[PDB]
Design a protein around this nucleic acid. Structure first.
Lengths: 61, 50, 123, 170, 196, 106, 147
RNA sequence: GCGAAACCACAGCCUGGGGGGCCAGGCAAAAUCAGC
RNA sequence: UUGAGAAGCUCAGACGAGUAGGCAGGCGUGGAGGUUUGUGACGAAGCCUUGGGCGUGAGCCUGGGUCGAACAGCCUCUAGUGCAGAUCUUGGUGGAAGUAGC
RNA sequence: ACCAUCUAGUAGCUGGUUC
RNA sequence: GUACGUGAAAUUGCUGAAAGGGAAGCAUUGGAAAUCAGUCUUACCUGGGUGAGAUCAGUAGUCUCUCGAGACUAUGCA
């Protein structure tokens, strides 16, 4: 888990993450304190998928 | 002196608009896409049915 | 100047908590039989001009910028010279497309839009 | 560089112009004192000199483990414990920029730093550990002269049920 | 000058209405008061002074279901517990929470025999009363109104004293050893100049 | 635990009040060993608190604290009149406080 | 139909309902709040005793003039009675409560009554709406050892 | 098994003092039924 | 030094219960003319809300849910324009109660 | 006796009279 | 889903969390639980070098207005 800090973009993340032995790369994308979408890319050139999370439930609920 | 005061203040205020909207246009910022009530009430309807 | 409020609890019409016909908006009592009208101690207070707030820090949000209903894309343009004393509150019936274009331009004018996040999920 | 924008909210001419600040009379340089709050509370320390507002104090770091700190003169309880000689120590090396923090300063992180993390361990520099041995070496013999003083420092202060600070004397 | 978490107030020689006012404030102060030998409290005025002042209180009962009237308690402990019940706002939530911090018992139970027993110097009889005055003892009084347990406690307390007396001589013999050992430590006599 | 306790034990006594009107913005505090309104001039200005223990744990612990200071003496018996950043709850009558010895001037 | 209960998942649960039932409203309720939270087959053995006066159902809320019985103390309630018309209606429902898992293909011997609801109806008496939820007992898997 | 209606400011313990409510007291445990 | 909506701006003092009564400024509702290069199927009005904001107040602005075709601010004109009460009118629903009772 | 109609018979008066 | 557009209040049942020693109701000050908002996201400002041109050209043309004021099309980008 690596929280995104400051000014960095997804296309620059993927090339910066493939060089350290990583395979895929998820991005949880909240808005207004609810998580609504999820994108996962495939490194370094693989297909990138943009789902949207829905009917979200935690483990406590 | 009142009128020339305004023009110089609306020059400081129009330059700050171009010096900002140019930097703002060059950053990479998320896409404000609209939500649609007809197509989020359809999903919620067909979710529990599926 | 730091904003301040002389009161924070609004006024609540007498016995508008017991009865559901009587609404909570304030109405001055009209009978001299009243306990409240004679202002007996222990009863609720009243709206007076004493609780009027500062004539300079009035109408201000707790941040310090006053509000302004912008209902289209040329209503935020007037706020170009007033970005440090006004916050561009978008009106409620504005569509979720005409809204996303006020935000992208008010951001160029450095104007605080208070509820830019409505109907707009970002990706 | 810009013509001033809206609302000339220019401040008035402030009459407030602080003059020399002056500490108490009990805070003489070299007077053993009590330290009240923070991390090294209770540990009796000795002052080296008076700064503008704060003091520049240290416990003899061998005796207590207290480094050369600044302490605001209010969280110090002065004490009439016997004094020492601080003429041999050069306190003028310390200034208000000596104890200034090390300037976060945002050195360029080469934004990839989001992933890779490092740490300078913020280690005390070689200059701090060096003078700590130096200033202590030129006061340890001084408190060796006064009996019960080396062991006065290393102890702590702790009032007890059955004691009441106002009527007791410090 | 005491903020003990629990205080034990031995009550022999005290006045009732002055100890019940000292205690009533320390209950609301947050302490935990135990009043032992409540049976040997004193009241200004001669023997019949409070006697008709309490035989009058027996004539006072409700006139509806007389098992719902006033409960005239006869124990020496509850005589004084009554005294600390009107001194407190016992109809609030802070009164009835204060009253359960007070434990008023007669004699001395063994859970408080082996502890310190402080006294109040502002409520004592030998101070607050003129010499040669009329005073009545509660435990000697309430026996004549129904507290039928006088001859047992006077017997029980007599056994505790001689046991405590036996405890004292062993304690008294203890510090006579340290009385020698205190001056035998030579450092006391040349370093008494710190006041000690 | 006798190598600790750099404060003075106290007890929150009551709110400021008249017979019928209470003023919860300013408290009454009884310091231990302070038994005169001339002996209370030593504790004027000290920063008092009120430490307690909540059930739900936040930031790796459970102890919370309400700070404040001491403003006036109060009466002839050595009580004082304090003032807290948050007014003390009325269910803390007869509790225990701490009168921290700083800002110390002695 | 949109039901009132968060339970009744497709997984291990099934539902039936009964609307416009011409019984009383203050009489099927006390039955309903007694059978609630129980297993299914036990409730059948339970209510048939009500039909033969072998067990009375307590009247907790609408306890108007209900005479004391000897068997109301099995639950601690003073007053109880033996309604027969209302429990006749519940038997009709619980048949559909079975016969819906019998078509969904559940496990029948872990089946509890999860949520029974009794409402009012548009007055013509005091008619009733009833919906019922029967669900499996949501068992627990033992934890794997250590990590 | 069917099944009202009157009525409905909110209500429900006693003593004393200016009544159910005020002041000071006595006290105070659920939930109900039969006489009264 | 720009603070000329001179119906604005600015400086200083005193004052502040209020009955019958007198005066003044505003808030809100349905329609009418003008105006906003006005808002709206990417969701108008309404409705609900343990959300936020403003005004001393009448009130207004807004986030979320619901919903489905219209609607509002400003300047004027106009009135079938504001409800706690009338043993008030109509409608709906309660406690008494599964009691009285058949 | 009842039914419409003038009638929106009759107050010195009883209740109510809306930001 | 014809008990059918939107579906308020009274009022009823279930679920969740609380409170309740012969009165609640509300006002004020705060504790505990739940939860919400705040731009803080980043922005700002300061030199050199490298490249781009335009309102620059010891520069050539068009049009609309009024010598030059804007809009341009070249070409260089000194």
């Amino acid at each position: 888990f690596r929280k995104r800090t400051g000014d960095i973009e997804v296309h620059e993340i993927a090339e910066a993450a493939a060089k350290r032995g990583y395979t895929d790369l998820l991005v949880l994308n909240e808005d207004r304190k609810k998580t609504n979408a999820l994108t996962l890319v495939h490194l370094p050139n693989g297909p990138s998928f943009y789902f949207t999370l829905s009917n979200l439930q935690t483990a406590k609920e | 002196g009142r009128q020339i005061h305004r023009c110089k203040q609306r020059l400081t205020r129009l330059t700050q608009y171009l010096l900002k909207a140019r930097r703002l246009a060059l950053k990479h910022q998320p896409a404000l896409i609209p939500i649609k009530p007809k197509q989020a009430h359809r999903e919620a309807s067909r979710e529990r049915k599926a | 100047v730091n904003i301040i409020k002389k009161r924070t609890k609004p006024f609540k019409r007498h016995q508008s908590d017991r009865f559901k016909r009587v609404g909570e908006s304030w109405r001055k009592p009209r009978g001299i039989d009243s306990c409240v009208r004679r202002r007996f101690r222990g009863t609720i207070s009243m709206p007076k001009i004493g609780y009027g707030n500062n004539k300079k820090t009035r109408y201000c949000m707790p941040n310090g910028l006053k509000a302004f209903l912008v209902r289209n894309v040329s209503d935020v343009e007037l706020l170009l010279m007033h970005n440090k004393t006004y916050a561009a509150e978008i009106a409620g019936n504005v569509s979720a497309r005409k809204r996303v274009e006020i935000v992208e331009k008010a951001r160029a004018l450095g104007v605080k839009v208070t509820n830019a996040g409505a109907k707009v999920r970002s990706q | 560089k810009y013509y001033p924008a809206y609302r000339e909210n220019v401040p008035k001419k402030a009459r407030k112009a602080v003059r020399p600040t002056k500490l108490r009379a009990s805070l003489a340089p070299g007077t053993v004192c009590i330290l009240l709050a923070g991390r090294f509370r209770g540990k009796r320390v000795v002052v080296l000199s008076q700064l503008e507002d704060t003091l520049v104090v240290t416990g003899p770091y061998k005796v207590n483990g207290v480094p050369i700190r600044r302490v605001n003169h209010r969280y110090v309880i002065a004490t009439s414990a016997p004094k020492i000689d601080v003429s041999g120590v050069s306190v003028e090396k310390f200034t208000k920029a000596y104890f200034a923090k090390q300037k976060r300063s945002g050195p360029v992180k080469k934004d990839e730093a989001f992933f890779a993390e490092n740490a300078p361990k913020n280690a005390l520099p070689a200059e701090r550990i060096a003078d700590q041995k130096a200033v202590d070496a030129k006061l340890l013999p001084a408190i060796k002269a006064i009996p019960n003083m080396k062991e006065y420092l290393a102890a702590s202060f702790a009032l007890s049920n059955g004691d009441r600070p106002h009527l007791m004397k410090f | 000058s005491e903020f003990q978490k629990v205080v034990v107030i031995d009550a022999k020689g005290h006045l009732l209405g002055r100890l019940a006012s000292v205690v009533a404030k320390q209950l609301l102060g947050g302490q935990k008061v135990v009043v032992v030998r409540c049976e040997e409290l004193n009241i200004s005025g001669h023997f019949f002074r409070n006697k008709l002042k309490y035989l009058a209180y027996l004539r006072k009962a409700c006139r509806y279901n007389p098992s719902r009237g006033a409960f005239h308690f006869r124990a020496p402990s509850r005589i004084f517990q009554k005294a600390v019940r009107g001194m407190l706002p016992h109809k609030t939530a802070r009164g009835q929470a204060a009253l359960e911090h007070l434990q008023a018992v007669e004699g001395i139970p063994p859970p408080f025999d082996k502890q310190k027993r402080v006294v109040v110097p502002a409520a004592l009889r030998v101070l607050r009363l003129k010499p040669g005055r009329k005073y009545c003892t509660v435990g000697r009084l309430s026996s004549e109104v129904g507290w039928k347990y006088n001859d047992i406690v006077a017997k029980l307390e007599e056994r505790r004293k001689v046991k405590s007396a036996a405890f004292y001589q062993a304690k008294l013999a203890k510090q006579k050893k340290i009385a020698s050992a205190k001056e035998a430590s030579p450092v006391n006599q040349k370093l008494s100049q710190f006041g000690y | 635990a006798q190598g600790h306790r750099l404060y003075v034990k106290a007890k929150h006594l009551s709110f400021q009040r008249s017979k019928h009107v209470i003023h919860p913005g300013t408290s009454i505090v009884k310091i231990e060993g302070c038994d005169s309104k001339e002996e209370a001039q030593f504790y004027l200005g000290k920063r008092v608190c009120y430490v307690y223990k909540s059930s739900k744990a936040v930031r790796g612990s459970k102890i919370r604290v309400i700070w404040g200071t001491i403003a006036r003496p109060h009466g002839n018996s050595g009580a004082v009149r304090a003032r807290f950043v948050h007014n003390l709850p009325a269910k803390t009558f007869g509790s225990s406080l701490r009168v921290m010895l700083y800002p110390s001037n002695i | 139909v949109r039901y009132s209960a968060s339970p009744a998942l497709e997984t291990k649960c099934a539902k039936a309902r009964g609307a416009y039932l011409r019984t009383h409203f203050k009489n099927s309720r006390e039955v309903a709040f007694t059978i609630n939270g129980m297993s299914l087959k036990k409730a059948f053995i339970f209510l048939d005793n009500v039909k033969e006066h072998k067990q009375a159902v307590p009247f907790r809320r609408f306890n108007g003039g209900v005479g004391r019985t000897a068997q109301g103390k099995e639950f601690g309630v003073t007053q109880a009675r033996w309604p027969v018309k209302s429990v006749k209606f519940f038997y009709d429902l619980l048949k559909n409560a079975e016969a819906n898992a019998e078509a969904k293909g559940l496990d029948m011997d872990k089946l509890i009554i999860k949520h029974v609801q009794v409402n009012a109806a548009p007055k013509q008496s005091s008619p009733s709406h009833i919906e019922i939820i029967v669900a499996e007992e949501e068992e627990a898997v033992p934890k794997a050892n250590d990590t």
